[PDB]
Amino acid sequence: PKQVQEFKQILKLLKSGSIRAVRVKTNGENTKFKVRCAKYLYTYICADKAKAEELKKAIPKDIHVVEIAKKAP
Amino acid sequence: AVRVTYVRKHSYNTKSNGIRIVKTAGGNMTVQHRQKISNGVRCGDCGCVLAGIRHIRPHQYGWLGKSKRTVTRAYGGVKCHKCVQKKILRAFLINEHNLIKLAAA
Amino acid sequence: GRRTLSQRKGRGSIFKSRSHHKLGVAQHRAIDFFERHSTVRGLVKSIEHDPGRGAPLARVVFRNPRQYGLDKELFICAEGLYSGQYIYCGSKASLHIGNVLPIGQCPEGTVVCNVESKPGDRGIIARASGNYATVISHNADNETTRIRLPSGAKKTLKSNCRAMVGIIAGGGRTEKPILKAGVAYRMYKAKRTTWPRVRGVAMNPVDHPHGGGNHQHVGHPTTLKRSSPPGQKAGKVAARRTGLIR
Amino acid sequence: RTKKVGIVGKYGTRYGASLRKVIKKIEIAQHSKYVCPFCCKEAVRRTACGIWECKGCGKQIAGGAYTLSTISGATVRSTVRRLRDAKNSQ
Amino acid sequence: KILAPGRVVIILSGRFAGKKAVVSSVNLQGTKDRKYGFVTVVGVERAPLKITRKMSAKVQEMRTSVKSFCKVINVNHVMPTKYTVNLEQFNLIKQVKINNFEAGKVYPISQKKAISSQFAEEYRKGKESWLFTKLRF
RNA sequence: AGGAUUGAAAGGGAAUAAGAUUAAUAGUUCUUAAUCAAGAGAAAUGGUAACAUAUCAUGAACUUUAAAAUGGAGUGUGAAAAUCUACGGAAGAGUUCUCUUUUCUUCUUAACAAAAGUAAAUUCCACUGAAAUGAAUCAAUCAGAGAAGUGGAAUUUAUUGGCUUUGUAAGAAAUUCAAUGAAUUGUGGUAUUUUUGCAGUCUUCAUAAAAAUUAAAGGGAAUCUUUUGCUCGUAC
RNA sequence: UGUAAGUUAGCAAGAAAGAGUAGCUCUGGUGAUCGAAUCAGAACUUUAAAGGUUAGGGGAAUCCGACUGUUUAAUAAAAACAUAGCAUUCUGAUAAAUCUAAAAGGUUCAUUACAGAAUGUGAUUUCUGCCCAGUGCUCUG
RNA sequence: CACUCAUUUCGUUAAAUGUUA
């Protein structure tokens, strides 16, 4: 597992076709966008709800998205 | 305290059977397997440990980057800077002495 | 009777040399043209402790006379040799300590070591600690020279027999009194199995020719002929004299 | 600290007065420092029997078993030097 | 003066250890940024290779190419030699000044190849020989 | 090109962890997350220097170097874990007509990687040149073949880079509560022990393995995705 | 607190001999920019205190072996063996000793007299007297 | 007595031996 640091690199990950799945985990303070790629699982810790919504919109519609909360699937 | 067991079937505390007991989730402790401590590179002349090269197992040098297993200098990774500096002075001063002593003195 | 310990030593089962950590064979380099008619230069890279022998060994590196590469040698270090020294082997080598010269090039009275008994056999005589041979006289009529062995005997060798100029390092090793049986035990760590020696008188008649009776005594003369068979050749053999000499 | 049993005090009372006195002379010389013949620093120390290493100067020298240079090897060095002069000059 | 412009020196330490270089300017006192005695040297990073009659003319010219470098070096890290070049023949070396060196960024590749080309041209004419032979340590 | 076979389930050695699961196997199954090997799709810069740059930035024959790979004792010390303990609590349990703001239990987190913050030890580099000699250690030990001081480089510290922290990752697990759903999961210590390194000291008429295999150098000849991973042991 | 003869001057030595020690309430000393158990002292009380467990009996001589060590598994652990020290003998390596029926065979020997091989006595101090007829051994006869 | 040619003991990568030039 690797972590992307700022908002720019994460977008290029969803823009690229290498993506396989996306899981969004909402915590009591932040929300993590975990992009399941071929080799690694990249994650972005978004602490701003406004920028979280922007990242949710940028997800391609043909990919599976899992929304996680206090209860795991 | 929590007592542990070996995971592999080596029952003796040999050099390759080193373990570390670390804490895991729920309070129980698991057994790791720790690497052996390795030496570094030595200058071929003075036998001093060379700088800029990590002390890892021989097969792990292949995994490193190209620049991480040598020094960007003549005889880098086999001779110290003091070892090299004397090689340069030996080469130039002996040839210069031969030029005047012999070779049309 | 049984077989004595001297007989069991010849089969070599537990009495084999404990030569596992030894550096190697210490000798001169093989004689070639460049050492018969010229000189080669060798660098003393290091001085090491050869297990089982009292003198230090030198790791000399001659470059190569005919091919490309190195020629790593292993000499018996002469006293005064140091790391990084240049030594020379050859007929025209200078008379300096550590150089290897034919014995005929050494002046009379020269002190040499690691002398060859037969030319090209890479050293036989004067190899233990602090030991040396002295050149007595030369004889150009038959190309032979006379040297004095460390035991005092004189030997006549071919003038092209090779030897190293100087004293074998490590002298005075035997002048230090061993004090403990443990120290003597460690002395044979890289040697044969010989140390704890049971006296023959302390054995039984089956074990030894000295194996006594109700009193610990030999009972017969301890000076024996050289023609005594193995198993009875215990004691002093062909003893010309005997006792505290005056 | 001790009147006369200085370094052989580690032997206690169990090897004979003379044997402790003979080895006392040798152990003092064996564990002493010597002047380096190349850099003149009192830094040469024995590592193995016959091997003397010069600490602050980086030289390994072959010598005696318990001293840097034996008296027998000292005359030999002077004997060879004199013999070489005779050969070099006539 | 041992270290004067035009003097040939040998670099002792650094990436260019054992290369041959020509002194351009000398500053034994140093500056505010350079707190040491230093000289600016133009050197031969890659000495030319030997050529024979069998190699074609385009291979011969390629094989005789000289790779140069310009570097500020501590005066303690160079060993001066007894050789001197004519700074008029190597005119481009004269313009390699201290201010031309900016700490942190790459030396201009245009100046390096301009000196490199003229270094190879003088080697082809055979005017300087000790400068363009690789020193075998 | 140099010497054949066998010889270690304690020596050397490419690479996997946590949780769950079975009446019984599990670094082997399942979930998630990794790693390794073998495959497929006229030749760079920076720094004075020590040396440094997500492959970068070519490097054949030949040769060399280093690693794998090396005793023991004793002292000091870095880090982790366990034990003990300070502060602040959350949840549950024990005693309670005699008191006890009380006693007890849980408050955790892997391999592999990241690089906010910040260490100890050692070795080197630049400036300058030390006597009125200084520097320092438990001990030592060191210095014009250059001390101390100032500023730097490197390596070691049980994976990347030692520790806190971060991704994995709380969604697991632990402790509770309700009838599957909810709650919590701070910060410290000039303390002891074990483990693991490190630094110098001592000791030897003792100097305390080799090979497979790996990397680098000198030389200058030539011009991200994806596939597979066989055999045997594995119960007690 | 104190400790003798003897001594290889290192020891003997924990010699021998004597006094103290509990509980409670306090004080002081030993550091860093709050903390460590450790030491010393002072009141008062008692059944007068290491002792539940753990935990040397000591002295004066003599004999043997110097010492650490080893030994008759299953009646002998020692004064026996080893030991370091001392001394003797042979041997220049194609040798000495010595295994093998033989052997470009084997061992000490990857060695070379400060070494290899064969023996006796058994640390240190002091001393090793006279005898070469006999039996050995040796001779450059 | 002189030689080497069987024979003995060796050393090497059988790596400049011997005679002229």
Swiss-Prot record, chain C:
Provide any one GO MF term from the record. Answer: RNA binding
| Ranges for region Disordered | 206-246
Q: Name one Pfam family in it.
A: Ribosomal_L2
Broad class of where this protein is predominantly found = cytoplasm
**Compartment list:** Cytoplasm
Top-level lineage group? Eukaryota
Q: Which InterPro entries match?
A: NA-bd_OB-fold (IPR012340), Rib_uL2_dom2 (IPR014722), Ribosomal_uL2 (IPR002171), Ribosomal_uL2_arc_euk (IPR023672), Ribosomal_uL2_C (IPR022669), Ribosomal_uL2_CS (IPR022671), Ribosomal_uL2_dom3 (IPR014726), Ribosomal_uL2_RNA-bd_dom (IPR022666)
* GO BP field: cytoplasmic translation
- What GO CC terms are in its UniProt record? cytosolic large ribosomal subunit
Q: Which UniProt keywords apply?
A: Cytoplasm, Ribonucleoprotein, Ribosomal protein
Tell me how this protein assembles: Component of the large ribosomal subunit.
Q: Which PANTHER family match?
A: LARGE RIBOSOMAL SUBUNIT PROTEIN UL2, RIBOSOMAL PROTEIN L2
Q: What function does this protein fulfil?
A: Component of the large ribosomal subunit. The ribosome is a large ribonucleoprotein complex responsible for the synthesis of proteins in the cell.
The similarity comment for this entry is: Belongs to the universal ribosomal protein uL2 family.
This chain's protein is named Large ribosomal subunit protein uL2
- Originating species: Entamoeba histolytica (strain ATCC 30459 / HM-1:IMSS / ABRM)
